[PDB]
Design a protein around this ligand. Structure first.
Ligand code: FKS
Ligand code: FKS
Ligand code: K
Ligand code: K
Ligand code: K
Ligand code: K
Ligand code: MG
Ligand code: MG
Ligand code: MG
Ligand code: MG
Ligand code: ZN
Ligand code: ZN
Lengths: 344, 347
C-alpha cells in the first residue's frame, strides 16, 4: 500500500545557529538534516508520491492562533535586529509567577510574553519556514479529505508545543491543531489528535482544552522530569465542555515498548468510544532508544507495529512530523510508521 | 574632612557571587552586575569619610523567611549542586518557564525548578551565589539593627541587589529582597508601619508583590516605563494594591529623556504619599542607574542631583535604611551613591 508525503524545501529557511542548553549556546537539535533524512528514506523506500504544499494563506492558521501572535512571528526578527541585538532572537525575560499577562511594547517583552522557553531561537526565515510547515500539514489534510486514507505531512519546524499564542519547544504554528481545525471547518464533526511524540503535546492540549469536539491525547515522558514540565500531568482532563476530552498518559525513564503499548491501547480505546470522523497523529520518533534527549526504549521495529496499530483504528489519518533527533535513524523510524500503516 | 555619622555595612562575601556569563541580546556575555560595583562604591565611602564601615552580623535564615517562602530558600541553597549533578556544563540559567496557559506547579527536575522560580534568564546562578545572597540580606539586616538601636540612618551596601525578587522568584540580578527583609524586620520589632521607596531606575516589582495585599507596608517606586524596559510585566500606574493593600502601592512611571526636574516631581508625589501614610520607618531601595551616564538609563540625572535626592529624603524626618540596588560601575558610581548619603547628612 502507498501513501503520499507532503514536503516543502522552504523548511531550510529556518537554519538557526544557537540553542540555549545547560547554560551554553550549542548547535540546535532541531536541525535541517532531520527533514532531509526522512525525505531521503521516503524516496528510498518508494513510500509513495512526494508533493510540495499548496499555499493556504494565514486564514487556516488564524483559526487556531491569535492574530497578535501571527503578526509577532512575522515581525519579530526585524524588530530584534532593529533594536540592536546581536544574537539570534532569544527571550531574556518573561511573565514570571506574580506578574501580569499584559502585552508590552518593547521587543524583549513581547518575546517573553509569547514564549515558554529560551531554547527556540528565532532568526531570518523562521516566519517563512513556519508558514511552509503549516501549509504542509494543510495539504496533507486536503489530500485525506479529498480521498486519501492517510497522508504524511513532513513538517519542519514541528508544532505540538505551540499554544494559540505561545511558541516554544522548537514549535511555532501547531501544525496538528491546524489540520485538526481544518477537518472541523470542512464538516468533520469530531476530530482526535493522538500525540505519540516523546514529549507532551502541551500546545495541542491548551488549544482545544475547553472543547469536546476535538479529543486530545498524548503519551509522553513524565513532565515532572522532562519538558514541558508545567503541563502534561495525568490530572489534566479538560475544562468546561472539554472535561474528559483530554487524556495524558505519562511514563518514567527506561519505559519499553511493552509498557508504552499499554498506554497506546488506553489511547486507542478512548478514541474508539469517542468515535471521531478524522485522526491527526502528531508523530515523534524521539521515543527511540537512541534518542539523545529522551528516555524511552522503542526499537526501529516497534515503529512498524505502531503504524500497524494506528491503521487498525480505521480512520482518515494525517501524520504531522514532530520530534526525533537521532539523525541516523530518524528517517528509518518515521517511514517505518508509514510502512507499518500501509501493511508492510 | 572628618568622619561622618552615616555608617555603611559591607560584606566581603559579596565577591562569592562572581558569574562568568549573562544572557543578553541572544549572546552569553560578561555580566553587567560585577563585584567591582560594590568595591568602587566602598572606595568612595572611605575616600569621603562618610562614616564607620562594619561587616554584617549573621542573623540566620529566620528574617529572610519572614519574606521568602521556605521552598524558594531551599531551592537557592541547592540550585548549583543540583545543576552540576544533572550534568549541565554552563552556569545555571533557566531554559523553560511557566508560560501563559501552563500550570504554576513545582516539578522535580532541576530545569523545571529553575524556571518555576525565575522571571528571567539574565541572572546566572553559580557557586557562591547562595552565600553572597545570604551575606547581602545580612548587610540589610545589620543596617536595620543599627537604626533600630539609635542611628538616624544607615547604608546597607548590598550586593547582590534585591528589589526584583518576589517571595519565591529571582531575577533581575536579585535573589533575596534585602529592602523587603529590612522592612519586615522593622515590622517584627514593633515598628507599626514601614514605607519602602524605590528610586532605582527599574520598578521594584519584587517589593510590590511581597506587600501588595498589605496596608502596613507602603511600597512606592519611580522607574522607567515597563512598556519599554524591564520588568515589562509589572510596574504600571494602575497597580494600586489589592484587598487591604488597595491604595498602598504607588508606581510612578517616566519616559525616555526624563530630566531631574520631572523625575523630582514624582519624587515629591512619593514623598507626599509617605507623609500622609506617616510610617515609623523608611527603607530606600537606592539604585543609581538613573544616572545620565548609566548605559541602561534613559533618565538624565547628574551627579549633583544625587545630593539633592539625599537632602529631600532626609526632610521626611524618618529612621531610614538605604539598601544598594542597581547602577553600572561607570567611574561615577561611587560618587553618585555616596552623594545620596552626604546629601542626607547635610552636604
Ligand atoms: N536546549 C534545551 C532544549 C532541550 N529539549 C527541549 C524539549 C523539546 C521537545 C521538542 C519536540 O521533539 O517535542 C518537537 F517536536 F516539538 F520538536
Ligand atoms: N541581559 C539582560 C539584562 C538587562 N538589564 C535590565 C534589567 C536589570 C535591572 C536590575 C537593577 O538595576 O534594578 C538591579 F538593581 F537589580 F541591579
Ligand atoms: K506525546
Ligand atoms: K479537548
Ligand atoms: K524604582
Ligand atoms: K502595600
Ligand atoms: Mg528591551
Ligand atoms: Mg546510532
Ligand atoms: Mg532537565
Ligand atoms: Mg502611626
Ligand atoms: Zn519530542
Ligand atoms: Zn536598576
Amino acid at each position: 500500500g502507498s501513501m503520499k508525503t507532503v514536503f516543502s524545501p522552504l523548511h531550510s529557511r529556518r537554519h538557526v545557529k544557537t540553542e540555549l542548553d545547560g547554560g551554553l549556546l550549542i548547535e540546535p537539535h532541531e536541525k535541517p538534516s532531520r527533514a532531509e533524512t526522512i525525505l531521503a528514506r521516503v524516496k528510498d523506500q518508494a513510500l509513495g508520491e512526494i508533493l510540495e504544499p499548496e499555499e493556504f494563506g494565514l486564514g487556516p492558521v488564524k483559526r487556531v492562533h491569535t492574530a497578535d501572535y501571527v503578526s509577532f512571528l512575522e515581525t519579530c526578527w526585524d524588530e530584534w535586529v532593529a533594536a540592536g541585538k546581536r544574537g539570534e532572537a532569544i527571550p531574556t525575560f518573561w511573565v514570571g509567577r506574580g506578574m501580569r499577562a499584559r502585552l508590552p511594547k518593547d521587543i524583549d517583552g513581547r518575546l517573553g510574553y509569547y514564549s515558554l522557553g529560551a531554547d527556540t531561537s528565532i532568526s531570518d526565515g523562521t516566519w517563512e519556514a513556519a508558514r511552509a510547515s503549516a501549509n504542509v500539514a494543510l495539504t496533507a489534510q486536503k489530500l485525506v479529505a479529498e480521498g486519501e486514507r492517510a497522508a504524511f505531512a513532513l513538517c519542519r519546524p514541528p508544532g505540538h508545543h505551540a499554544h494559540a499564542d505561545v511558541f516554544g519547544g522548537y514549535c511555532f504554528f501547531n501544525n496538528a491543531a491546524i489540520a485538526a481545525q481544518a477537518f472541523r471547518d470542512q464538516g468533520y464533526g469530531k476530530v482526535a489528535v493522538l500525540d505519540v511524540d516523546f514529549h507532551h503535546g502541551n500546545g495541542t492540549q491548551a488549544i482545544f482544552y475547553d472543547r469536546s469536539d476535538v479529543l486530545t491525547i498524548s503519551l509522553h515522558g513524565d513532565p515532572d522530569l522532562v519538558f514541558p514540565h508545567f503541563l502534561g500531568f495525568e490530572d489534566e482532563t479538560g475544562e468546561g465542555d472539554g472535561e474528559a476530552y483530554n487524556l495524558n498518559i505519562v511514563f518514567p525513564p527506561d519505559t519499553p515498548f511493552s509498557i508504552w503499548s499499554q498506554g497506546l491501547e488506553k489511547a486507542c480505546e478512548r478514541i474508539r468510544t469517542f468515535a471521531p470522523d478524522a485522526l491527526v497523529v502528531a508523530l515523534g520518533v524521539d521515543t527511540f532508544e537512541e534518542d539523545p534527549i529522551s528516555f524511552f526504549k522503542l526499537t526501529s521495529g516497534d515503529y512498524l507495529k505502531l503504524g500497524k496499530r494506528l491503521e487498525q483504528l480505521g480512520l482518515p489519518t494525517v501524520f504531522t512530523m514532530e520530534g526525533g533527533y537521532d539523525v541516523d535513524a530518524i528517517g528509518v523510524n518515521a517511514v517505518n510508521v508509514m510502512q507499518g500503516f500501509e501493511g508492510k
